[PDB]
Write a protein that binds this DNA or RNA. Sequence first.
RNA 1: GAAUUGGCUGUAAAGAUGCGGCCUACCCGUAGCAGGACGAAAAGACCCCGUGGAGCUUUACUAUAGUCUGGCAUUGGGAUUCGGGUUUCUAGAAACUUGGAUUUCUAACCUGAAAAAUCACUUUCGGGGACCGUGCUUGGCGGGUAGUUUGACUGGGGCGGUCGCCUCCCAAAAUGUAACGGAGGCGCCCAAAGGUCACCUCAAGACGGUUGGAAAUCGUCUGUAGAGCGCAAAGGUAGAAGGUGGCUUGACUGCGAGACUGACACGUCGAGCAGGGAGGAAACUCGGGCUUAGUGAACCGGUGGUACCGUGUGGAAGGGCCAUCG
RNA 2: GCGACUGUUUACCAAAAUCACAGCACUCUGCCAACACGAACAGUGGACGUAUAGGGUGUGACGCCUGCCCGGUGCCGGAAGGUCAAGUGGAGCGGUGCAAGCUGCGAAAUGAAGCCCCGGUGAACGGCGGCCUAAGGUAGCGAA
RNA 3: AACCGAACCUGGAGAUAGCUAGUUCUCCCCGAAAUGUAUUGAGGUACAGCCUCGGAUGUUGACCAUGUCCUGUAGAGCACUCACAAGGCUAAAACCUUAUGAAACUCCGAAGGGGCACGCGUUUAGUCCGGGAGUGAGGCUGCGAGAGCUAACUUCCGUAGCCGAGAGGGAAACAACCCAGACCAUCAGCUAAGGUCCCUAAAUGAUCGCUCAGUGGUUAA
RNA 4: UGUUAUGGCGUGCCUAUUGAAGCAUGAGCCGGCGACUUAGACCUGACGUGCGAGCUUAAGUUGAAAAACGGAGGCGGAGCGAAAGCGAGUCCGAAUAGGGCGGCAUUAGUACGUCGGGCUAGACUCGAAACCAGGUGAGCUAAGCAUGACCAGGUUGAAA
RNA 5: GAAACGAUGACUGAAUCCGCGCGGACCACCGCGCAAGGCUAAAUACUCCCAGUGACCGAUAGCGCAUAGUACCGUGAGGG
RNA 6: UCAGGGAACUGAAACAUCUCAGUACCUGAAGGAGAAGAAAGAGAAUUCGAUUCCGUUAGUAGCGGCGAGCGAACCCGGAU
Lengths: 63, 74, 49
Amino acid sequence: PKMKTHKMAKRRIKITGTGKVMAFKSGKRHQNTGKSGDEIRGKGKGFVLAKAEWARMKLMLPR
Amino acid sequence: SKNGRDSNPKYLGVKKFGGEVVKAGNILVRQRGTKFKAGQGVGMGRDHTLFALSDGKVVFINKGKGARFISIEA
Amino acid sequence: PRIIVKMESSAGTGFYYTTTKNRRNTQAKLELKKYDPVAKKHVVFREKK
RNA sequence: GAAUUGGCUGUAAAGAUGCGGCCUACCCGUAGCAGGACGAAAAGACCCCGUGGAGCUUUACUAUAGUCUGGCAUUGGGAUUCGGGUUUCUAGAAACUUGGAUUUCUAACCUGAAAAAUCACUUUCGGGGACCGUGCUUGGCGGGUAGUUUGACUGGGGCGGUCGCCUCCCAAAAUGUAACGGAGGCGCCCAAAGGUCACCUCAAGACGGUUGGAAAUCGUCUGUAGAGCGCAAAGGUAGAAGGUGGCUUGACUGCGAGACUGACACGUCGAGCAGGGAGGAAACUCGGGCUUAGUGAACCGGUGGUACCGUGUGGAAGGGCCAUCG
RNA sequence: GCGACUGUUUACCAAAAUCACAGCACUCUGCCAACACGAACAGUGGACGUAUAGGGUGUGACGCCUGCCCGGUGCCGGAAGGUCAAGUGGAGCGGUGCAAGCUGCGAAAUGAAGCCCCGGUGAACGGCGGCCUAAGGUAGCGAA
RNA sequence: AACCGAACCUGGAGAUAGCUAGUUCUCCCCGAAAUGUAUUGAGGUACAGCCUCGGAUGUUGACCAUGUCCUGUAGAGCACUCACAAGGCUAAAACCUUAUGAAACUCCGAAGGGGCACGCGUUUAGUCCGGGAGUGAGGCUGCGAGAGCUAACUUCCGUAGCCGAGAGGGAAACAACCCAGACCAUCAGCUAAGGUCCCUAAAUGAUCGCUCAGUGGUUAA
RNA sequence: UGUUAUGGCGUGCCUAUUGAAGCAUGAGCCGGCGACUUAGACCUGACGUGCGAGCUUAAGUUGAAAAACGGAGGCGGAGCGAAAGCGAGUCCGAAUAGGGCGGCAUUAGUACGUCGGGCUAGACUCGAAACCAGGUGAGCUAAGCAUGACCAGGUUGAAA
RNA sequence: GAAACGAUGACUGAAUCCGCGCGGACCACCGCGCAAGGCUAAAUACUCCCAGUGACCGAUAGCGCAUAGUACCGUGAGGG
RNA sequence: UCAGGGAACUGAAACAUCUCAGUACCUGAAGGAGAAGAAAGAGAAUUCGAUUCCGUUAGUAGCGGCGAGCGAACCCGGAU
Ligand SMILES: [Mg+2]
Ligand SMILES: [Mg+2]
Ligand SMILES: [Mg+2]
Ligand SMILES: [Mg+2]
Ligand SMILES: [Mg+2]
Ligand SMILES: [Mg+2]
Ligand SMILES: [Mg+2]
Ligand SMILES: [Mg+2]
Ligand SMILES: [Mg+2]
Ligand SMILES: [Mg+2]
Ligand SMILES: [Mg+2]
Ligand SMILES: [Mg+2]
Ligand SMILES: [Mg+2]
Ligand SMILES: [Mg+2]
Ligand SMILES: [Mg+2]
Ligand SMILES: [Mg+2]
Ligand SMILES: [Mg+2]
Ligand SMILES: [Mg+2]
Ligand SMILES: [Mg+2]
Ligand SMILES: [Mg+2]
Ligand SMILES: [Mg+2]
Ligand SMILES: [Mg+2]
Ligand SMILES: [Mg+2]
Ligand SMILES: [Mg+2]
Ligand SMILES: [Mg+2]
Ligand SMILES: [Mg+2]
Ligand SMILES: [Mg+2]
Ligand SMILES: [Mg+2]
Ligand SMILES: [Mg+2]
Ligand SMILES: [Mg+2]
Ligand SMILES: [Mg+2]
Ligand SMILES: [Mg+2]
Ligand SMILES: [Mg+2]
Ligand SMILES: [Mg+2]
Ligand SMILES: [Mg+2]
Ligand SMILES: [Mg+2]
Ligand SMILES: [Mg+2]
Ligand SMILES: [Mg+2]
Ligand SMILES: [Mg+2]
Ligand SMILES: [Mg+2]
Ligand SMILES: [Mg+2]
Ligand SMILES: [Mg+2]
Ligand SMILES: [Mg+2]
Ligand SMILES: [Mg+2]
Ligand SMILES: [Mg+2]
Ligand SMILES: [Mg+2]
Ligand SMILES: [Mg+2]
Ligand SMILES: [Mg+2]
Ligand SMILES: [Mg+2]
Ligand SMILES: [Mg+2]
Ligand SMILES: [Mg+2]
Ligand SMILES: [Mg+2]
Ligand SMILES: [Mg+2]
Ligand SMILES: [Mg+2]
Ligand SMILES: [Mg+2]
Ligand SMILES: [Mg+2]
Ligand SMILES: [Mg+2]
Ligand SMILES: [Mg+2]
Ligand SMILES: [Mg+2]
Ligand SMILES: [Mg+2]
Ligand SMILES: [Mg+2]
Ligand SMILES: [Mg+2]
Ligand SMILES: [Mg+2]
Ligand SMILES: [Mg+2]
Ligand SMILES: [Mg+2]
Ligand SMILES: [Mg+2]
Ligand SMILES: [Mg+2]
Ligand SMILES: [Mg+2]
Ligand SMILES: [Mg+2]
Ligand SMILES: [Mg+2]
Ligand SMILES: [Mg+2]
Ligand SMILES: [Mg+2]
Ligand SMILES: [Mg+2]
Ligand SMILES: [Mg+2]
Ligand SMILES: [Mg+2]
Ligand SMILES: [Mg+2]
Ligand SMILES: [Mg+2]
Ligand SMILES: [Mg+2]
Ligand SMILES: [Mg+2]
Ligand SMILES: [Mg+2]
Ligand SMILES: [Mg+2]
Ligand SMILES: [Mg+2]
Ligand SMILES: [Mg+2]
Ligand SMILES: [Mg+2]
Ligand SMILES: [Mg+2]
Ligand SMILES: [Mg+2]
Ligand SMILES: [Mg+2]
Ligand SMILES: [Mg+2]
Ligand SMILES: [Mg+2]
Ligand SMILES: [Mg+2]
Ligand SMILES: [Mg+2]
Ligand SMILES: [Mg+2]
Ligand SMILES: [Mg+2]
Ligand SMILES: [Mg+2]
Ligand SMILES: [Mg+2]
Ligand SMILES: [Mg+2]
Ligand SMILES: [Mg+2]
Ligand SMILES: [Mg+2]
Ligand SMILES: [Mg+2]
Ligand SMILES: [Mg+2]
Ligand SMILES: [Mg+2]
């Protein structure tokens, strides 16, 4: 058998593309925020780098 | 009063040096105030870090002690 | 509780909140500015709530 | 472990028959002794460690036997005062109540005596009594019982102190760098201490001056600065960031070429493009503050929009996206 | 010195100043008693006992005696007021239907015990102090 | 029922065990780590960093030279801040001659160090994509510092080398020191450190001196 | 080849370690037993084979001294997005700045097999203190209950 | 949990074919089905027992036993 | 096989929900099998047509200190 860790799916980590692991951008969630308007905006979609092998087998079938 | 305190390193210093080819948007020196001063071809950020506008060979100007400038030559 | 506070802004008939509030130290009841919601124009922001 | 197993002194993981130098010692036993072989026995009960255990404790957490308590059921007629219900009728009351409440009643039920010892039957019969007990549910109490928690660094542990962020030595002229090394700050502030436009230039001392006279205030001359910059220091600053007025919010939405920095995850700076503003005559400068501290991933939720999802379909519950709060 | 005394204990390192003990005291308990074993409206023990009795606690023959502090905690009473659950109540807010109606929430008022609150209580837990706390050591003893 | 802070037996059950111990045939090739961040973390793990294998690229690697920029240590100095030595002047701060100390002083300031270009020159590693790791307890000496008593085979950072995993010669013995990196054989030759009276391989060497103490072969005021 | 005398040289083995001849662990000796496995249409790579823009079956049926059949289903072939959806384009957005993606380098995939790892399960072998369930024990011992038995001899001298 | 539906422990308590239940709060429409009565072979599991077979063992292996739940241990359960 | 009861070590790198698992164990009933079984169903095609078993769907949809982890059904292909 082999589960997906459903902590991967609707969480960041899109699997997509030429096999590389996109993730999101994190801080200032909906926890409180004054702070800058150019950071409140720059929290869209990141993509990680040297951890991908771990992320992939979290969710190798792309759920 | 045992005072075990201290503060994380701030990677301040001169980044791109004399005769390095640079690019637009490269950060060329890090400083607290203005040890090195803006100069032509070179902007300066809100934390006083001066940085390139144009591409090319870089700076070298230093006669004024407390009056030293960075620049870019096309 | 406190002195300085958070305070929502509401558009003159728009929506767009912007929640960057400053001190209750000297602005004892005042709180009006201007910036654009979803209509392009900058408009009046009453920061009551 | 195997041994063909001496003394001194030296070295070796720091107490050497076994390594080095020097001394001594023919081979083998028997009776004895108890310095050595870190002699033997029990993988130290002390001590520290393990996100081991178990016994016990309490006003540590959490349940729970037990127990108290309101409602409903077993559970029943009556009289009585009834906040009121319905058709009754010359504000008004008899058929009647849905009930609550003392009070009272005897067929439920409990319990006792009579040849029939526990039980069953009649009871001239006796007493209690719709309470109690029991069944479900509500809340309290509940170390009686039960499952667990009880951080780390640490010149052994404990006690004391210390856990994040900023500044300066240390830090060896690049960046970096430990110590329970040496010093000191932050968990904010500012409707203007912000944008821009315009204009002033500070300490300090000397002579002379109204109550003040070491130091208020004025006046002249000196005056890279000996000031100031909201706070800590360090850098920086005289063409100003410092001190002052006029207008107003760029204390903006959509973005982000390129780089600094970090194992990540975060963090920093940002030219330039669009929508729309602001000050300026303009060039131009504005996406907070001289800069470096004023901070919390994720989860779960509150509030405002949006109309993406919404399980037969059309909606709505619920969810997502954007913004914000805890 | 300690304990009054006979006695009892750690089978296998402790026999004692430990335990119990007569005597004393507080409190509980009206009889299907309190309390204890129990899957149990079963049955028993208390006890074929009934307050001169039974349970629980602490002291520990006998003699002289057993002081001050009810603020905290516990316990017994009070029970004007505050708070508080299910339930009764359902005014009002929304969906969805053409409508009839169905339907998601949902208050105010009224709802117990308990706790806050007020008294008392020490042979109740306790306390009798550092050059304000509720009070601050009555007798007797003291380098034990 | 010969070990009772919770009996014995069987079962769950191969409990769980970041902890100990053990893990066996052969030759060949390469060859580490005891660092950095985070951690109910500290003797455990995750990601980096260092190893290996295969693929791609193809000198991009390494020293060394030249050119260029960056730096505030050593030293030094007293022009700021602190401390501070003897005088003059005076209502003593200040001011002058003479005179100093400094991690948190700096008017100055090296040698060195780093970034870039070039290869004007000799070398041969580099980088990227993937599969497998181990390691995350380091120790000693010289140099530079803190803590310590300018103690320690102390402790904690930096830096080079060795041991760790390094056999061989020297240092009597002796991980770290000196010389030197062991493919196998030889009853052949040259050297290094260190040696040449006998144990003990090799000049009782040659020329000038020195010490008459066994100094050599154990500190100082 | 066996055995000797004599010279030179020469600090057991393992483990654990900064560092072992160590006066640190283990072991009397010899024999034999004794520890990196298995499983699954599971993941991810290396090598090899078949067929290749396509590759392949599962359960089963029928035949078995032998294997064929069986397309249900699985993997490539389209990506971007929270998603509806668009689609070599897509998402953010009021259009022009980006993220990911196809082109170009179309690296060609798939089913088997052996192997390196991974996941799950005792998962390299051996080792707990303990936790829970149902039973066995009061023939020892702590106690209770019913019924029996036992205590030479001597001294003292209470009430009445 | 927006938490339907089945299930009973306690208290209540309907409707008939223009009627009753469901389609994941709920409503309308549109669909699917007739509860509170029973029985029902075969395809499935297992292995005390028997037969055949084996890139299964062959005397420390293989079942504990080349036979033995014996000897032996325990008061016993039980171990062996 | 079905039923009435129903653990805990363990994993979560601590532990309460959670997992282990309706596993072990105890008890009741029955047979060669048993259970289940003839739609107030599945479900979205106005498809299907008792039950059971196997393959696949698919680790998909979902569940979840949204942690550890747990995990369907329909369609379709078979046995009957
Ligand atoms: Mg996608
Ligand atoms: Mg302190
Ligand atoms: Mg020595
Ligand atoms: Mg010696
Ligand atoms: Mg010797
Ligand atoms: Mg020898
Ligand atoms: Mg003797
Ligand atoms: Mg031990
Ligand atoms: Mg524990
Ligand atoms: Mg209860
Ligand atoms: Mg309750
Ligand atoms: Mg407890
Ligand atoms: Mg409690
Ligand atoms: Mg500790
Ligand atoms: Mg430096
Ligand atoms: Mg340096
Ligand atoms: Mg370090
Ligand atoms: Mg120090
Ligand atoms: Mg200005
Ligand atoms: Mg204008
Ligand atoms: Mg700009
Ligand atoms: Mg909302
Ligand atoms: Mg719908
Ligand atoms: Mg909504
Ligand atoms: Mg005495
Ligand atoms: Mg006595
Ligand atoms: Mg004894
Ligand atoms: Mg005894
Ligand atoms: Mg004795
Ligand atoms: Mg009774
Ligand atoms: Mg009785
Ligand atoms: Mg006593
Ligand atoms: Mg008294
Ligand atoms: Mg005396
Ligand atoms: Mg015993
Ligand atoms: Mg015996
Ligand atoms: Mg025990
Ligand atoms: Mg075990
Ligand atoms: Mg288990
Ligand atoms: Mg454990
Ligand atoms: Mg080599
Ligand atoms: Mg950090
Ligand atoms: Mg570590
Ligand atoms: Mg690694
Ligand atoms: Mg290679
Ligand atoms: Mg290069
Ligand atoms: Mg090169
Ligand atoms: Mg110096
Ligand atoms: Mg000069
Ligand atoms: Mg070349
Ligand atoms: Mg790799
Ligand atoms: Mg391998
Ligand atoms: Mg370490
Ligand atoms: Mg070190
Ligand atoms: Mg010192
Ligand atoms: Mg050391
Ligand atoms: Mg080692
Ligand atoms: Mg080496
Ligand atoms: Mg050597
Ligand atoms: Mg040597
Ligand atoms: Mg030698
Ligand atoms: Mg020596
Ligand atoms: Mg040594
Ligand atoms: Mg060696
Ligand atoms: Mg020679
Ligand atoms: Mg020589
Ligand atoms: Mg010679
Ligand atoms: Mg000579
Ligand atoms: Mg010999
Ligand atoms: Mg050691
Ligand atoms: Mg050694
Ligand atoms: Mg020995
Ligand atoms: Mg030994
Ligand atoms: Mg040891
Ligand atoms: Mg031994
Ligand atoms: Mg498969
Ligand atoms: Mg399967
Ligand atoms: Mg592209
Ligand atoms: Mg394969
Ligand atoms: Mg791995
Ligand atoms: Mg497991
Ligand atoms: Mg038990
Ligand atoms: Mg007996
Ligand atoms: Mg007799
Ligand atoms: Mg007699
Ligand atoms: Mg319904
Ligand atoms: Mg239902
Ligand atoms: Mg529906
Ligand atoms: Mg064989
Ligand atoms: Mg046998
Ligand atoms: Mg034999
Ligand atoms: Mg046996
Ligand atoms: Mg026997
Ligand atoms: Mg017997
Ligand atoms: Mg547990
Ligand atoms: Mg656990
Ligand atoms: Mg639990
Ligand atoms: Mg079983
Ligand atoms: Mg059974
Ligand atoms: Mg039977
Ligand atoms: Mg079928």
